[PDB]
Amino acid sequence: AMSDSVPFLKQPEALDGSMAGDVGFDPLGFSSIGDINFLREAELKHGRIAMLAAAGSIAQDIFTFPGVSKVVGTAKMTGVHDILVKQGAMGQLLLWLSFLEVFGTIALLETLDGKRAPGDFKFDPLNFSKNPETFKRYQLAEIKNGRLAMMGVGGMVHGYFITGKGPLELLGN
Amino acid sequence: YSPVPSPEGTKEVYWETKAPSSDVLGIGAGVSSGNFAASSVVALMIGGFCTGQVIPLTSDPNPLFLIGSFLLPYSWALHVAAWIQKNNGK
Amino acid sequence: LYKDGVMQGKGLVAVPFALAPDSLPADIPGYVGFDPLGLSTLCNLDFLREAEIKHGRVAMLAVTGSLVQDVFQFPGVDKVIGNAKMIGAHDKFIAGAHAGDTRSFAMHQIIFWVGLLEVLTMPALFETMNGGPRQPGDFKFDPLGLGKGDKLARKQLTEIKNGRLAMIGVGGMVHHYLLTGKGPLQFLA
Ligand code: CLA
Ligand code: CLA
Ligand code: CLA
Ligand SMILES: CC1=C(C#C/C(C)=C/C=C/C(C)=C/C=C/C=C(C)/C=C/C=C(\C)C#CC2=C(C)C[C@@H](O)CC2(C)C)C(C)(C)C[C@H](O)C1
Ligand SMILES: CC1=C(C#C/C(C)=C/C=C/C(C)=C/C=C/C=C(C)/C=C/C=C(\C)C#CC2=C(C)C[C@@H](O)CC2(C)C)C(C)(C)C[C@H](O)C1
Ligand SMILES: CC1=C(C#C/C(C)=C/C=C\C(C)=C\C=C/C=C(C)/C=C/C=C(\C)C#CC2=C(C)C[C@@H](O)CC2(C)C)C(C)(C)C[C@H](O)C1
Ligand SMILES: CC1=C(C#C/C(C)=C/C=C/C(C)=C/C=C/C=C(C)/C=C/C=C(C)/C=C/C2=C(C)CCCC2(C)C)C(C)(C)C[C@H](O)C1
Numbered sequence A: 001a002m003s004d005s006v007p008f009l010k011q012p013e014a015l016d017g018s019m020a021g022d023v024g025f026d027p028l029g030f031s032s033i034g035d036i037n038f039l040r041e042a043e044l045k046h047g048r049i050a051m052l053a054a055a056g057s058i059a060q061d062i063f064t065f066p067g068v069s070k071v072v073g074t075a076k077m078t079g080v081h082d083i084l085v086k087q088g089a090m091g092q093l094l095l096w097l098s099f100l101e102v103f104g105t106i107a108l109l110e111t112l113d114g115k116r117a118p119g120d121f122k123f124d125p126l127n128f129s130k131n132p133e134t135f136k137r138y139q140l141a142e143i144k145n146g147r148l149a150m151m152g153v154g155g156m157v158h159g160y161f162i163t164g165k166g167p168l169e170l171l172g173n
Numbered sequence B: 001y002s003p004v005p006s007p008e009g010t011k012e013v014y015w016e017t018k019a020p021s022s023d024v025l026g027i028g029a030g031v032s033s034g035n036f037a038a039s040s041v042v043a044l045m046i047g048g049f050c051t052g053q054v055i056p057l058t059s060d061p062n063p064l065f066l067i068g069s070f071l072l073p074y075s076w077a078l079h080v081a082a083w084i085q086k087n088n089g090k
Numbered sequence C: 001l002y003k004d005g006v007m008q009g010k011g012l013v014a015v016p017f018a019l020a021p022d023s024l025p026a027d028i029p030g031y032v033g034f035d036p037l038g039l040s041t042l043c044n045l046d047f048l049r050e051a052e053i054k055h056g057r058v059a060m061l062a063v064t065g066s067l068v069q070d071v072f073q074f075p076g077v078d079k080v081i082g083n084a085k086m087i088g089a090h091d092k093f094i095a096g097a098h099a100g101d102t103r104s105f106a107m108h109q110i111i112f113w114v115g116l117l118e119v120l121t122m123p124a125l126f127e128t129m130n131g132g133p134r135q136p137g138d139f140k141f142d143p144l145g146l147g148k149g150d151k152l153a154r155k156q157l158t159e160i161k162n163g164r165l166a167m168i169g170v171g172g173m174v175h176h177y178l179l180t181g182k183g184p185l186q187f188l189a
Helices: A036-060 A070-073 A081-085 A088-110 A134-162 A167-171 B022-028 B031-053 B063-067 B070-086 C045-071 C087-099 C106-128 C149-182 C184-188
Strands: none
Touching: A036 A070, A036 A134, A036 C149, A070 A081, A081 A088, A134 A167, B022 B031, B022 B070, B031 B063, B031 C106, B063 C045, B063 C106, C045 C149, C045 C184, C087 C106, C087 C149
């Protein structure tokens, strides 16, 4: 039994294919070390935070909120972080996300006992998982867009490091 | 006398064979010996390189090389785990 | 194997007074009989075969780049490197990367990506050396599906032979550089 993504390599033992986006991709064998539920919860958190970060980088190129342009000047992307650490935006967001992540710590503790699916916060206010096939399709789409947004945020921020422009300022010329 | 308590999941790892069982590696019990040996070589190289970068220590050391210098004592435990997994048929 | 017992495999003896080791088997593509120094006894056979194949494939890419870089240079390479080629180029790329030039980072990019590929393909070595179903050199990389049948066998032979041939060629193309400079086609003519 060889892995589908890497055909010359043996299939990982902790990868069943039951999870969304499972193509059997683990050449370094990380799933043998960690719990797979912990690893999937980490992957979902990294991917969702990266989805919000990618959308935020694009939107902060597109437009700015009222008054932000005087506080930050012309210091787009990660350059605002330091500035807004001098202001109170970053501390406020850190406090509220720390609250949410205390409750996420309780949720992870319940995941590690086998009584919670990884990344399952049961947050579906506008009901979209109304059918068990749309649920699988949305799970695959969430994990794929999370990985894509992880690498997209990496690209946007490191290209900003080289150029100082931004994701859409770079495409402007 | 009274029962001595242990944390949950505590097993008997006493061994008299050539190598210990893989359970003594804890979370690394399922890592193959080749992966352990490769990681030990890589950890030695990275730790030695980072250490040699920070041997003329200044008042502003690079944090990345400071973190990477800790892989040099990690590589010892890695090659011990490599020997254990190699003599455990893994 | 392709012409087994005639071109490769059983019976063939390359050096009659220095027989190859009897530990060296007879069903590896490229076995002609040639191990006069008995160097197959000093290492794992899977490691030796896959090392030979990897050295050969890298040498094949090195010869076909060594000729083409004499023939064709990509647009704008003249601005960074200029009139240098082969052993010089590597050096001055790093020198440019040492100078501060943010556009001469070619060898750092290739060392990054080739090292990542080697790191990710190390478990193929580890499973091959444990008697796994993967044979040395087999990464199952056949996009065009051309060696999908018996045609593979011939190809295997030619691969190792061309690999060995390429392995010699680079060495000439390097040491012939180190005495004179110039390049393979500048040295031929
Ligand atoms: C990783 C996520 C992330 C992070 C760290 C930041 C960080 C920042 N943003 Mg940004 N932003 C994000 C995502 C993110 N954003 C997204 C997703 C958008 C919309 C596409 C924006 C749009 C945006 C604008 C327009 C502006 C900023 C600005 C800023 C800076 C000041 C803070 C502020 O006013 O934010 C304001 C940001 C918002 C009000 C967006 C909130 C939208 C959230 C993500 C919706 C989440 C709903 C979700 C369903 C609830 C789930 C709860 C729970 C179940 C998990 C700060 C550096 C300002 C700045 O300095 O610009 C240079 C500014 O003008 N952001
Ligand atoms: C690619 C996007 C995407 C998709 C397909 C999903 C899919 C899913 N999520 Mg999920 N999620 C995402 C992003 C996504 N998520 C992000 C970024 C966060 C962090 C805020 C979360 C947080 C989250 C939680 C906390 C939970 C889920 C849950 C779920 C599942 C329930 C079905 C559902 O509501 O999804 C339907 C989702 C969509 C149809 C996606 C809508 C896409 C919007 C409309 C577009 C956004 C536009 C953007 C804001 C504007 C950009 C501006 C531009 C200038 C850049 C499902 C598998 C729940 C679950 O698994 O249990 C039931 C659950 O508990 N998600
Ligand atoms: C051992 C391999 C090797 C190495 C180390 C180099 C090194 C170099 N080449 Mg070179 N080159 C090679 C092979 C190689 N080449 C091959 C095989 C060709 C085509 C026949 C070329 C064609 C070429 C040109 C035209 C130019 C260079 C140039 C350069 C220099 C700058 C780096 C660069 O942009 O490369 C560019 C290299 C390429 C675009 C070739 C990469 C093609 C790869 C090998 C195809 C692999 C396909 C295969 C299916 C992948 C399998 C992967 C895995 C499954 C095993 C550098 C000294 C430039 C220079 O400085 O000129 C002096 C330049 O202008 N090379
Ligand atoms: C699985 C497999 C592996 C694979 C792998 C891959 C390589 C995994 C590597 C993954 C990387 C890509 C993870 C990326 C996370 C991105 C997020 C967390 C960053 C979010 C940005 C932050 C929140 C922000 C910022 C924000 C603020 C502060 C300022 C704003 O002005 C801007 C902004 C809005 C952007 C390998 C190959 C190793 C093999 C192994 O066998 C198994
Ligand atoms: C689930 C929950 C929902 C909620 C929700 C949330 C709001 C859903 C939204 C999820 C959103 C945030 C998805 C974001 C995806 C980012 C994509 C993958 C990436 C692009 C990055 C790559 C391509 C790139 C980059 C590239 C390079 C690097 C650099 C640049 O020069 C160029 C470029 C930009 C092209 C709601 C409330 C609706 C209801 C539901 O009941 C429950
Ligand atoms: C004749 C004969 C036979 C035979 C045979 C034999 C014995 C063959 C012998 C071959 C020899 C002697 C090859 C020697 C070297 C080749 C190398 C290292 C290749 C590439 C080097 C490179 C790229 C380099 C480099 C460099 C780079 C890139 C970076 C620089 O900073 C440094 C540097 C300059 C070092 C057979 C078997 C048929 C039997 C027959 O009866 C007799
Ligand atoms: C906010 C802030 C900051 C910050 C910051 C931030 C926001 C930093 C974010 C960094 C992130 C998200 C980095 C991601 C890097 C991803 C990489 C290298 C992926 C490589 C993929 C590879 C090699 C291969 C991929 C692949 C390929 C092609 C082939 C194989 C398969 C596959 C795996 C698909 C600071 C630090 C500047 C400070 C500032 O004062 C405040």
